[PDB]
Design a protein around this ligand. Structure first.
Ligand SMILES: Nc1ncnc2c1ncn2[C@@H]1O[C@H](COP(=O)(O)OP(=O)(O)OP(=O)(O)O)[C@@H](O)[C@H]1O
Lengths: 51, 466, 510, 160, 309, 71, 51
């Protein structure tokens, strides 16, 4: 269990670092999908400037 | 709740005692228990509106008695929440019940804007685990272990050793475990305030410890409203990195103040005077007697239950929540002893073989077998004749007497209480000095060398000087 | 890198949507809100008990649908709500998952969100209530019962179709004690339930850890219930926690239903009835104890072919849908003398009462002597535990009655001294301990030493470990065919020959 | 403030008393007699009377006295029996209950109260609400059309 | 359960709980036993009006439930009060609580259809001599002289059972005296009906007894309404030439349903947890099983006391 | 017309100048099997018997205005 | 230990992903707050003329 705690902490840190590194792709894809599918005006003039 | 003013004003139609016919403006109230700080006569009274029938005309009640104002009081609520003064740096001063000075001293040292945020740990934490740290003692630490931040509900009568609990627990809960501690001062008077303030301030039970206050002279709401301030002010110091310690008043104040306050007001009364809602809060006790993700709120309960009982309604729930029992009388201290604590009457609940082991479960068999065999064999031979002494009766008056009676030691910081200060013991002294020296290891071993020793390991090694 | 599939589901679901409603439709407007009792002045001409969701994930049902306003049901937070949120139009009522596909995981109050997954689907999201079975098609199947106790496995067993009102004593123990049924019975193969009534972190962690680590995990459902529930989860645990049990008992398989203590069920609904000015009687309860116990305690019955030939919609008409009624309760030191205790305990079949005097003193006997008895007895089990292992009243009444009256009347003869060694040695050495697993070897070991005369030679307490370990290990290891005798009935030439030769050779060669 | 006592005054006066051409006397007598005591003089000065002849005759015959048999009989029976102490829902209960034979009122499309002349289901609401004329007003009519897709997509897709 | 003639009445008003406060007709209310067959949901759930009131909203109480109804359910007017189907042809199958069946089909033998509310106690043409009976036993008839058509009580625990009394009384009393001995049952188990009925196949009594039991899965009004089947069905055989002999089960259904339903309706009654309708039902129902000129009306008084209260 | 009386509500609310209820008879407001309220009876004696529908001497309880309880 | 490490890594990786609240809050707030630009009279006809 003590030897597996380091692997669990390394896996959790790797998942947190992967999600933090993927936050730009998720925010860009969510901003492009919401701006391109907001059911109002298909225009990406206003920048969201998200993380 | 409601902080602090605004929302236009109001007009009281009928004025009564506590629960009066309060009526504010058209749609200008807040949530439940909104303490509207309005100028009721002279001082700014805060009437908490528990009901929410419509908008404005709700049942409001203050912390005291509002009988005296005329028919036309302007009750104005607010929109934000009532942030009480609580935090993590509040230990070391004397706080009041509402967040001010108790004995004309310092108030809350930290202002974290606590708006009655009752912290409760769920299943995504360190639940559950056992603590069993230092104290330092042997039979009190090994024969009666506690959980990681559990509610150790004790039970005792008059003269059960009040200085041993505060003196022995004032150093272990402020230097051994976590430095942040707190103390409950609800339900005090001249002897309680003078003895608790002088005894706690003259030793090492004041710094660092957030001493609370609270008098039961007015209604039971202000003197019994220790859930938000107590659960949000004493448990807020566990998020800094270490644990947090606190105290309790009495078990009869919750049932007497809750049943009398909830039954003497009119509303919320259908269980023959008993409150069926506040008792549900007891269901959250399991979320407060365990270790959280950041700390452990070690709420040390006092020796109080159903009219001083050990196996009643309120006494059975406090003993089953911990890993030990609750029994303390004058029989241990009546025969000449320092620490008034029963060893044979206060056994551990988790003293089995599955949640212990050989070294962990070996201390219960030596104390239980040495205490029952030494007390029964010594009492049977001493209550009859000395000719019926074989090996256990003739040998249990030296090894079992000093080993089973060496737990009465001084406190860890008794520099002005018991005279001499005892050393800090661990778990190896009880198993090493009680798992082999209680039946016959050093042969000749009197009770004079183990009467002032802080640990049992010195009961067999330091027997050459007697 | 972390989204991947979230962009397709979020873009498709967020881009598709549907339309725009809320036009010329009365969705119900709440007049006031007294923390739970919300007077909904609108949409009163609907279904009787329509749990319409208001602002959020709730289920406000019509408590009293009158000619104008109607009270709402609190489902979570209701103290912070005001009078201005109104409600919403919703015709769904009692939408829970019923089926045998999710029987095994950790269920919750309204679903299966207490486990780590949460996506444990069943067969169909139907109602959570349960009704009674057939009147003339309630053929009870006499099957064997093997829980985990070595003394209760042959005294009074309850197979299928029996209702034994168990009364658990407090202070070690009612929540656990004899919880060796899942570890000792291995795979049950039935749709058993475990409805709770006020759990915590130690009960869910110790029960979930010891149940999955000591025995079978995915074999029976477990309806968890927290202590912060009002009346829609705590009081509706026995009435709403019997959905999966209706998936196997009405088709042709086996099912069971077990609840927790009766204090939270009968005391949780007493505050909402007395606090809303309704009807009251016994412990703030009028006729709610007689109507809830009829469709719960008297509903789990073993169906035959007529009751399951039409409820299964053409499936297993040839099989008999068995259902065991495991109605247990936690008595607070013998707290069973009210209307719900006498009516619920007397309206069923069996009533097992256990005291805390024999279990709270250090002995291994948890059940009382003569107070715990079922209805079917030992005749409904195997043949070896019916006519060869069924004399607890003779040894308990003769040993306790003949050995308890020895204070003023001393000088025991031959009729009184023989019951002390056999009664004390058999009752003190044949009783199971705490969390002790018991297999099917209780009939072979109990129908040989306590019938022929193998236990009379070793009546001492110190000879039980060497005689039981040497005779049990030598007899069980030297002959593997004797275990086959535990695969069926017995009481024939193989029982007398294997028991006489194994008991004489194992008891004489030790 | 009659609530349950408001169904008899509105349902009993729109059937038996409707044959005497009393469609205009109930609105002027109920609105004038009920609205004339809405201040802080006639309500506290007329509601605290000892007998019913002084409050009914003074309050129903001293402030304009624009009534006849229904005003004197309804004011004397209601004032002597206990119904003239409030009478706030007399205009809405009498107008809505008496005008139920030709009641045509729709709802709102997340904007303002249009109150269309639709006596049945989907009568004049489709042509009046879809045949502009008016399409969007200044009461957040066109701006509230995205609440369904924005609230449904954001609220339903906010869980992820 | 009434003969509807017209099907009019009106709508409803409030429907909270079991209080059927439906506004039927204005000045055309029915009787006490004349129930209104309202079309609540899908089935015709009738509600017996226990107390009529002005306006239309009368204090009515239904047996079962409405199976999900709205606030304005349509009702229907009736003519004949308590029009159920019974007669002397019920000795053949198991009966229900509303004149129908519980075993096979046929509504427990469909024959006559008169009033369900039979007469309680009467004289004039009734037998006032009160003759004695004889069961034909040495430990029942020779030790206790029972009367012809009386309500003899029972006590004790087990020992005899239902098989000894039903099997021994279904052949000796049936052949030694002309008459049909029926039975009843209010407050039984759901599984006993799947076992005790098998005893009917071991003594041939199913063709000479009408088992009218309500089990216990229903409420108080739906399971405690078995008094009309015994009194309405037993009067057709005792007043024709035979001698009826009913058999009760216990008193927990009538005492708990009568005291709880009569005391939990918002009205005060007797003391010690009792109701004020015990003297009328016990005195009027206990004196109805008497001897007549056309046949003795016997009934097995199998009432259960509350632990010797 | 505060109370729902149909005939007495419209007649009393539309013509309160003519009551005519001094004949000590009239009818009854309701009948709850025994507890029947005799309407009117202003000049009737309190406790006197009166033959109602059938053959029963219905006697009033007290003379509280015009709402006398007939049994 | 392997099942506890896999369950802890799956629960920490599935519960530590802030793309739902971050992408839903940023996309919903940016799309709902940035829809006023380039929406004069063209967005009122498509959303108000469909009734
Ligand atoms: N007959 C017995 N002999 C010895 N130990 C027992 C016996 N029955 C139960 N126990 C012990 O009790 C423990 C379980 O206690 P449990 O949690 O059931 O108490 P409880 O029912 O919660 O108590 P309470 O009813 O007072 O809340 C087990 O660990 C087991 O060792």
């Amino acid at each position: 269990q003590a030897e597996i705690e380091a692997e669990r902490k390394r896996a959790r840190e790797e998942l947190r670092k992967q999600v933090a590194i993927l936050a730009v792709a998720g925010a860009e894809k969510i901003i492009e999908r919401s701006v391109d599918e907001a059911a109002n005006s298909d225009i990406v003039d206003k920048l969201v400037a998200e993380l | 709740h409601h902080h602090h003013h605004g929302m236009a004003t109001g007009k009281i139609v009928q004025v009564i005692g506590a629960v009066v016919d309060v009526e504010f403006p058209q749609d200008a109230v807040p949530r439940v228990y909104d303490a509207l700080e309005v100028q009721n006569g002279n001082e700014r009274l805060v009437l908490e509106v528990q009901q929410q029938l419509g908008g404005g005309i709700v049942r409001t009640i203050a912390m005291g008695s509002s009988d005296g104002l005329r028919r036309g009081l302007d009750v104005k609520d607010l929109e934000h929440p009532i942030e009480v003064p609580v935090g993590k740096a509040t230990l070391g001063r004397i706080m009041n019940v509402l967040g001010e000075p108790v004995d004309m001293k310092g108030e809350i040292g930290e202002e974290e804007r606590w708006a009655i945020h009752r912290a409760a740990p769920s299943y995504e934490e360190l639940s559950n685990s056992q603590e069993l740290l230092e104290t330092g003692i042997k039979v009190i630490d090994l024969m009666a272990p506690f959980a990681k931040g559990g509610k150790v509900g004790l039970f005792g009568g008059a003269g059960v050793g009040k200085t041993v609990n505060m003196m022995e627990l004032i150093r272990n809960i402020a230097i051994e475990h976590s430095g942040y501690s707190v103390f409950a001062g609800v339900g005090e008077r001249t002897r309680e305030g003078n003895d608790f303030y002088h005894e706690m301030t003259d030793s090492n039970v004041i710094d660092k410890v957030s001493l609370v206050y609270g008098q039961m002279n007015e209604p039971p709401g202000n003197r019994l409203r220790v859930a938000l301030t107590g659960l949000t002010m004493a448990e807020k110091f566990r998020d800094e990195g270490r644990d947090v310690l606190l105290f309790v008043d009495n078990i009869y104040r919750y049932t007497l103040a809750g049943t009398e306050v909830s039954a003497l007001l009119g509303r919320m009364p259908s269980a023959v005077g008993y409150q069926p809602t506040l008792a549900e809060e007891m269901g959250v006790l399991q979320e407060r007697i365990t270790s959280t993700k950041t700390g452990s709120i070690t709420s040390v309960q006092a020796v109080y239950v159903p009219a001083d009982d050990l196996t009643d309604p309120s006494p059975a729930t406090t003993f089953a929540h911990l890993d030990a029992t609750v029994v303390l009388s004058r029989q241990i201290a009546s025969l000449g002893i320092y620490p008034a604590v029963d060893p044979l009457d206060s056994t551990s609940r988790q003293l089995d073989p599955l949640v212990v082991g050989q070294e962990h479960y070996d201390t219960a068999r030596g104390v239980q077998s040495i205490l029952q065999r030494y007390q029964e064999l010594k009492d049977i031979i001493a209550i009859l004749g000395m000719d019926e002494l074989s090996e256990e009766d003739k040998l249990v008056v030296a090894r079992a007497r000093k080993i089973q009676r060496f737990l009465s030691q001084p406190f860890f910081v008794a520099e002005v209480f018991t005279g001499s200060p005892g050393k800090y013991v661990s778990l190896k002294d009880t198993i090493r000095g009680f798992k082999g020296i209680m039946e016959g290891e050093y042969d000749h071993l009197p009770e004079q060398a183990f009467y002032m020793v802080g640990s049992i390991e010195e009961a067999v090694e330091k027997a050459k000087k007697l | 890198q972390l989204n991947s599939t979230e962009i397709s589901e979020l873009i498709k679901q967020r881009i598709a949507q549907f339309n725009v409603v809320s036009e010329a439709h009365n969705e119900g407007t709440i007049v006031s809100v007294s923390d739970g009792v919300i007077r909904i002045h609108g949409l009163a001409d609907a279904m009787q008990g329509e749990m319409i969701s208001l602002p959020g994930n709730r289920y406000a049902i019509a408590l009293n649908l009158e000619r104008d306003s109607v009270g709402a049901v609190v489902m979570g937070p209701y103290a912070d709500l005001a009078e201005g949120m109104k409600v919403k139009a919703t015709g769904r009522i009692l939408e829970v998952p019923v089926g045998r596909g999710l029987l095994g995981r950790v269920v919750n109050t309204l679903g299966a969100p207490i486990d780590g997954k949460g996506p444990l689907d069943h067969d169909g999201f139907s109602a959570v209530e349960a009704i009674a079975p057939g009147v003339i098609e309630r053929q009870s199947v006499d099957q064997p019962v093997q829980t985990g106790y070595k003394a209760v496995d042959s005294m009074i067993p309850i197979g299928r179709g029996q209702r034994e009102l168990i009364i658990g004593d407090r202070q070690t123990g009612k929540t656990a004690l004899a919880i060796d049924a899942i570890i000792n019975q291995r795979d049950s193969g039935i749709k058993a339930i475990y409805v709770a009534i006020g759990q915590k972190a130690s009960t869910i962690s110790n029960v979930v850890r010891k149940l999955e680590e000591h025995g079978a995990l995915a074999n029976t459902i477990v309806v968890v219930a927290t202590a912060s529930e009002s009346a829609a989860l705590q009081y509706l645990a026995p009435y709403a926690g019997a959905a999966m049990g209706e998936y196997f008992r009405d088709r042709g398989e086996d099912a069971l239903i077990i609840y927790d203590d009766l204090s939270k069920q009968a005391v949780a609904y007493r505050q909402i009835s007395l606090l809303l000015r309704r009807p009251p009687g016994r412990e703030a309860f009028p006729g709610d104890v007689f109507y809830l116990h009829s469709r719960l305690l008297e509903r789990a019955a073993r169906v035959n072919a007529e009751y399951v030939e039409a409820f299964t919609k053409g499936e297993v008409k040839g099989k008999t849908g068995s259902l065991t009624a495991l109605p247990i309760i936690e008595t607070q030191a013998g707290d069973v003398s009210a209307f719900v205790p006498t009516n619920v305990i007397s309206i069923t079949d069996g009533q097992i009462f256990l005291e805390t005097n024999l279990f709270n003193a250090g002995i291994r006997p948890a059940v009382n002597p003569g107070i715990s008895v079922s209805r079917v007895g030992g005749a409904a089990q195997t043949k070896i535990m019916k006519k060869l292992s069924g004399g607890i009243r003779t040894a308990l009444a003769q040993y306790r009655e003949l050995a308890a009256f020895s204070q003023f009347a001393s000088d025991l003869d031959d009729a009184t001294r023989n019951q002390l060694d056999h009664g004390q040695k058999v009752t003190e050495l044949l009783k199971q301990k705490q969390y002790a697993p018991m297999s099917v070897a209780q009939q072979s070991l109990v129908l040989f030493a306590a019938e022929r005369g193998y236990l009379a030679d070793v009546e001492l307490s110190k000879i039980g470990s060497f005689e039981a370990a040497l005779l049990a290990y030598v007899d069980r290891d030297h002959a593997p065919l004797m275990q086959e005798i535990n695969q069926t009935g017995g009481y024939n030439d193989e029982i007398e020959g294997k028991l006489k030769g194994i008991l004489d050779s194992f008891k004489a060669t030790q | 403030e009659f609530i349950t006592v408001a169904r008899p005054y509105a349902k009993a006066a729109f059937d038996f008393a409707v044959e005497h051409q009393s469609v205009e006397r109930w609105q002027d007598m109920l609105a004038f007699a009920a609205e004339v005591t809405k201040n802080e003089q006639m309500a506290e000065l007329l509601s605290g009377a000892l007998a019913p002849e002084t409050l009914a005759e003074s309050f129903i015959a001293v402030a304009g006295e624009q009534l006849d048999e229904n005003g004197q009989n309804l004011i004397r029976v209601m004032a002597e029996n206990g119904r003239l102490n409030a009478l706030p829902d007399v205009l809405e209960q009498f107008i809505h209950l008496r005008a139920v034979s030709e009641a045509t009122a729709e709802v709102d499309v997340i904007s303002a109260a249009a109150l269309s002349e639709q006596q049945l289901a989907k009568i004049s609401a489709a042509m009046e609400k879809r045949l502009s004329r008016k399409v969007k007003l200044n009461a957040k009519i066109d701006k509230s059309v995205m609440a369904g897709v924005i609230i449904r997509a954001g609220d339903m897709v906010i869980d992820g």
